[PDB]
């Protein structure tokens, strides 16, 4: 959130990574949106993948 230029994401629905555990309301940093359906994201110094459908870009 300090890093200028980074894109923040709002988690809309609780998500438990099958293969990250995110709660509704959590704010993530977008790391990689190369794939349209699965995005690499960052939360509290950890990284993982989440379906793009679970989040909204805050822009």
8 A C-beta contact, residue 50 and residue 38? yes
Give the count of beta carbons closer than 10 Å to the beta carbon of residue 44: 7
Q: Both tokens of residue 43?
A: 């939360």
- Which ranges of the chain does DSSP label H, i.e. alpha helix? none
Give the domain ranges of the chain. Answer: 8-57
Resolution reached, in Å?
1.3
Residue 51: partners with Cβ closer than 8 Å, 6 or more residues away:
15, 37, 38, 39
| C-alpha–C-alpha distance, residues 30 and 42, integer Å | 6
Q: What's the CATH number for 8-57?
A: 2.30.30.40
The C-alpha angle 18, 9, 6, rounded to 5 degrees, equals 120
CB-based contacts of 24: which residues, under 8 Å, 6+ apart?
11, 12, 13, 14
């Amino acid at each position: 959130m300090d890093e200028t230029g980074k894109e923040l994401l709002l988690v809309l629905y609780d998500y438990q990574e099958k293969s990250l555990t995110l709660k509704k309301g959590d704010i993530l940093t977008l790391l990689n949106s190369t794939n349209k359906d699965w995005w690499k994201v960052e939360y509290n110094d950890r990284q993982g993948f989440i379906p793009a459908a679970y989040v909204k870009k805050l822009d």
